[PDB]
Design an enzyme around this catalytic site. Structure first.
Site, PDB file in Angstrom:
ATOM      1  N   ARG B 228      -4.161   4.946   2.429  1.00 54.98           N
ATOM      2  CA  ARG B 228      -4.006   5.377   1.038  1.00 54.98           C
ATOM      3  C   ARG B 228      -5.401   5.528   0.430  1.00 54.98           C
ATOM      4  NH1 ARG B 228       0.604   3.728  -2.036  1.00 54.98           N
ATOM      5  NH2 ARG B 228      -0.593   4.404  -3.873  1.00 54.98           N
ATOM      6  N   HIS B 276      -3.999  15.584   2.551  1.00 56.00           N
ATOM      7  CA  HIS B 276      -2.881  14.697   2.837  1.00 56.00           C
ATOM      8  C   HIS B 276      -1.860  15.336   3.751  1.00 56.00           C
ATOM      9  CE1 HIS B 276      -0.355  11.023   1.344  1.00 56.00           C
ATOM     10  NE2 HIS B 276      -0.271  11.218   2.641  1.00 56.00           N
TER      11      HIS B 276
END
Lengths: 311, 311
Positions: B228, B276
Site C-alpha cells: 500500500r 496500481h
C-alpha cells in the site's frame, strides 16, 4: 629457463573485455598460457577459444588442434573453420541458457503486462491503467527450437503462457504447439501476440525479420530479437512499428555493435535497445570446458560438445 | 409488474471502471440486480462487493447480510466492517496471485539483468554492457508471506533465485530462508540485493519502508512495493535513492491514486511508477465467487473464504 606451458591457447574474441576475461580464467590453471592474437607466439598456439574470431585464424595460427566457440551458438565462426578438419567444440552451460530465458521473460512481461506503456506514460506523468492480460491469453511464438529455444519454450509453457514453436526440423515439446518448415510459417505466425527470434544465422534465415514475415503476424504483435542483427531488415521493422503491424520491439543484437549513436532504432518510442546482453557463458565456465576438452584430446578420448560442421 | 430479483447487490468500489465491470459481470447471471451506492435502492441491498468502499457503507446499506472484499487483501476495508457481526469474505483466485508474481518477476529482472540501466542509457544512445548476474547471485527478500507473498517466494526460488522471506508469524517454505518477527529484521535485510513488500497495511506496518529499514539493507539494494502507499515514507525513499542506499525502485501503490502529476517520484531517474496494475481479480471471478457464497448462505451452508476479522 622456465619450460613453456604444456598448454598454449589463443583467445580470439571480438569483445576485448571478453577475451581478457577468458585469458584470465584460463591462466587460473597452472601450466596454461593464454595469448591474444597480436602476440607472435599466438602463431604457435595448439588451441583456440573464439567469439567472432579473425576469418584468417587458421592462417595466423596454422598448428591448431582444437577450436572452441566461446558460446552455445556457432554462427559467428567464419566459413573456413567449418571447411577445415580441425575439431570444433562449443560451450554448453546451464547458467547461460537460464540467462537467455531471463531476458526473454523480461521482454514477454514488458509487453504482456504493459510495463512498456507505463514507462512511456511516466515520461509525461500520465496515470493510465490498462486491462490485465493473463498468461494463457498471451500467445508467444519461439522461432528456433534447439538447445536454447526449446528450453525457453518449455519454461514459458510452465509459467502458463500459450506457447507455439517453429523449427526447420521435427520437434515435439510438451505443452507447446510445434510447427515445422517454411510452409508452416503462416499458421505459426497467424495467432501470435509475441514473437521471439532464436534462429541461428544462415543464408536462409538472413533477413527473415522483414515485411513478409511481419505481415503474417496479427496487427499489434511484438517482436523480441535474440538471434543476430542480420536476421533483421531495419527499414521493415520501423515501417511495421509505424503502421502498428508491430506494437513494439525489444532488440539485443545488431549488424554493427556498438549500435551506432545515429541509428534510428535508438530513438523509436516503441523500441527497446539492449547492448547484446541477453546472455554470455562466464569466463570460468568457458575456461574449464576448454581445458577439459584439451585434456580429453591429449589422452586420446572423445571430445564433448563437438560441433557438427554439416548441420 | 416484474418481481424484483431474489439477489440484490451493492458494488462499492473506489475505481468506477472496476465497479462497473463487477456490476456487468454480476448482471450476466439472471435474477441478480447490481446497484451502485448512489441508487436509492442500494440502501436495501442484502449483499455487497467492496474495494475501498465508503466507511459509511453499513449506515447507507443497513440490511447487509454478506460483504465481499473484491480482492485477496482486506486492508482497504474500513474499520467498521471489522467491528460488525456481518460475515465478510474474500476473493481467492489463482489468476490474481499469478499476476502479482508476474509483476514481481518483471521487477526483479529489471534490476538483476540491468534493463533499468539499458533503458536509461537508451535515452542518450549510450551502449554499455554490464556484468551478467546469475539468479543464485541475486538475493531477493519478500516481506509478507501469506497467500500471495508465499506463492511469489516459492516461485522465485523455483527459478533459481536466492530467496529470503520475512513474516510476523512462523512460516516454513522449502527453498526460502524464512525469518520471523521484528527482531529478525536486521538479519533478513542485511544480505538482500532486492526487497519486495507484500505486507498488509496495519498500524504496525505503516511507514515501514523508511530510513530505519533502508539503512539496514546493503548499499545499492532495490525496492519493489506491491503493498500500500502508506507503507512508504516518500522523503526517505528519495533520500535513499540520492545517497545510493537504494539503487532503484519499482512502485505500484501510493497514498493518493492517481499519483498526482507533481509528485517528485514521477521524475526520479531511478524510479519506475506503475498505475496500481500489479494484479486484480477479474470481474467475472469476483461475480462468481460472490454469487456462490450468496447461494451457500441462502442454503444455510458454511461460507468459503471467510475473513477472520481478528487476525
Amino acid at each position: 629457463f622456465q619450460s613453456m606451458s604444456d598448454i598454449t591457447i589463443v583467445v580470439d574474441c571480438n569483445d576485448a573485455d571478453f577475451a581478457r576475461d577468458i585469458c584470465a580464467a584460463l591462466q587460473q590453471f597452472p601450466d596454461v598460457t593464454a595469448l591474444l592474437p597480436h602476440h607472435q607466439a599466438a602463431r604457435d598456439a595448439q588451441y583456440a577459444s573464439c567469439w567472432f574470431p579473425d576469418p584468417q585464424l587458421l592462417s595466423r595460427s596454422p598448428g591448431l588442434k582444437l577450436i572452441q566457440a566461446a558460446s552455445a551458438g556457432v554462427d559467428h565462426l567464419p566459413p573456413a573453420l567449418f571447411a577445415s578438419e580441425i575439431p570444433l567444440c562449443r560451450v554448453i552451460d546451464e547458467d547461460f541458457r537460464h540467462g537467455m530465458f531471463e531476458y526473454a521473460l523480461w521482454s514477454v512481461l514488458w509487453f504482456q503486462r504493459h510495463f512498456d506503456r507505463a514507462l512511456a506514460h511516466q515520461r509525461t506523468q500520465t496515470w493510465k491503467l490498462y486491462p490485465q492480460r493473463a498468461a494463457a491469453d498471451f500467445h508467444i511464438g519461439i522461432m528456433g527450437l534447439g538447445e536454447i529455444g526449446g528450453y525457453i519454450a518449455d519454461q514459458l509453457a510452465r509459467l502458463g503462457y500459450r506457447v507455439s514453436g517453429w523449427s526447420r526440423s521435427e520437434k515435439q515439446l510438451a505443452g507447446v504447439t510445434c510447427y515445422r518448415g517454411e510452409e508452416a510459417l503462416d499458421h505459426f505466425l497467424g495467432s501470435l501476440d509475441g514473437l521471439i527470434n532464436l534462429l541461428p544465422l544462415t543464408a536462409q534465415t538472413r533477413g527473415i525479420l522483414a515485411a513478409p514475415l511481419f505481415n503474417r503476424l496479427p496487427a499489434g504483435a511484438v517482436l523480441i530479437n535474440c538471434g543476430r542483427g542480420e536476421h533483421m531488415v531495419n527499414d521493415d521493422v520501423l515501417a511495421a512499428l509505424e503502421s502498428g503491424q508491430l506494437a513494439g520491439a525489444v532488440l539485443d543484437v545488431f549488424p554493427q555493435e556498438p549500435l551506432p549513436a545515429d541509428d534510428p532504432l535508438w530513438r523509436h518510442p516503441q523500441v527497446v535497445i539492449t547492448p547484446h546482453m541477453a546472455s554470455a557463458a562466464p569466463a570460468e565456465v568457458i575456461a574449464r570446458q576448454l581445458l577439459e576438452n584439451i585434456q580429453r584430446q591429449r589422452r586420446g578420448l572423445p571430445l564433448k560438445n563437438l560441433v557438427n560442421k554439416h548441420a
